[PDB]
């Protein structure tokens, strides 16, 4: 019931499937999918992978879980969730994050562990998938593949400095000091036309305070691909990764990395006349995991 618009994802069903996969994953399944059953271990394969990982996550206190998508392919009940994850990055990733938080708090509660749930529910957990299929290069990504998980490998040529990214504006009313904080949604900030107070109403009382806004890290990394396959007469191509938050300042120049993330496209403004955008979209990649 209740699939989201423009997608094939149902929140309840996807959360159910992800919880099922978390509860009942054993590495022997991946061994079966790898046709490596002759290497099946009695110890590690028996033990529940992600439950244990969530445990050491709880004791250590980390907030990020790295998920192998081929493990999702291994589990029969979540084979469809794999394709749902490729085709719909952001929605399914948020679903996974909520499910991780739910599983953490549930596991604490069920065992009645002395560890307090104050930190757990306040924390924000992130899921970082990887090993999501093949590479296919960048010459072979058609525009229909916008906002999908892609796997890229190459050499990190150049790394820009840290670029602050606005998260909350801090407009201040000059007249009645009505300092409202505006969160950014879908990269848009909406100015109060007049003073949001009813008693005080002065449109010119607003003057954004740059310094008291809350920002977030953003680093652009120039990656030159080294695809496993190269078409005839194709010189190497450079793509612009865009990392966020903790991944900033992680990848140094000269590192040979394999990166997975969301293949995005953004209009580029023709600066000849302001607020006029070119019809050709620039393509870049948001980064979720770096190996």
């Amino acid at each position: 019931l209740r699939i989201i618009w423009g997608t094939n994802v149902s929140i309840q069903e996807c959360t159910t499937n992800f919880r099922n996969f978390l509860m009942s994953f054993k590495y022997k399944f991946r061994k079966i999918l790898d046709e490596r059953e002759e290497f099946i271990n009695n110890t590690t394969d028996e033990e529940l992978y992600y439950i244990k990982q969530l445990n050491e996550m709880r004791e250590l206190g980390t907030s990020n879980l790295n998920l192998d998508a081929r493990n999702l392919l291994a589990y029969k009940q979540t084979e469809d969730l794999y394709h749902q994850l490729l085709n719909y990055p952001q929605e399914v990733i948020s679903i996974m994050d909520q499910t991780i938080k739910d599983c953490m708090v549930s596991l604490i509660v069920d065992n009645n562990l002395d560890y307090d749930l104050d930190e757990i529910e306040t924390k924000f957990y992130k899921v970082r998938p990887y090993n999501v299929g093949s590479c296919k290069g960048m010459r072979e990504l058609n525009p229909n593949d916008i906002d999908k998980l892609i796997n890229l490998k190459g050499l990190v040529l150049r790394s820009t400095p840290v670029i602050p990214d606005m998260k909350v504006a801090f407009f201040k009313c000059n007249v009645c000091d009505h300092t409202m904080a505006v969160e950014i949604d879908r990269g848009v900030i909406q100015e109060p036309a007049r003073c949001e107070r009813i008693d005080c109403n002065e449109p010119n009382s607003m003057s954004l305070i740059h310094n008291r806004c809350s920002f977030a890290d953003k680093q652009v990394i120039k990656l030159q691909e080294t695809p496993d396959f190269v078409p005839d007469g194709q010189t190497p191509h450079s793509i612009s990764l865009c990392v966020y938050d903790e991944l900033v300042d992680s990848c140094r120049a000269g590192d040979r990395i394999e990166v997975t993330g969301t293949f995005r496209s953004i209009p580029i403004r023709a600066n000849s006349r302001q607020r006029v955008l070119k019809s050709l979209y620039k393509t870049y990649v948001d980064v979720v995991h770096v190996k």
């Binding site: 009645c176 000091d177 009505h178 300092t179 409202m180 904080a181 949001e196 107070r197 009813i198 008693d199």
Partner: protein, 77 residues
């Protein structure tokens, strides 16, 4: 002032009539003097606590009204 303290006749003063009407009058200082019999309370810091409480609600410097947009105020039944 002039709590029967004019000591002279007046024509357009309620305090001039206060003697003839016997209607009681005190001063605000005398009001506190009589309140000493009653002794009514004036009202019916932790800077670190203030800061980690402003962790919630955001900063407290907002309009003292029924609107904050940080909370869905009830409108319907």
């Amino acid at each position: 002032r002039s709590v029967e303290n004019i000591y002279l006749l007046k024509d357009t003063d309620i305090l001039s009539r206060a003697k003839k009407n016997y209607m009681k009058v005190w001063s605000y200082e005398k009001a506190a003097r009589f309140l000493k019999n009653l002794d009514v309370d004036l009202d019916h810091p932790t800077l670190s606590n203030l800061l980690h409480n402003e962790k919630l609600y955001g900063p407290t410097d907002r309009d003292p009204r029924t609107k904050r947009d940080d909370i869905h105020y009830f409108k319907y039944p």
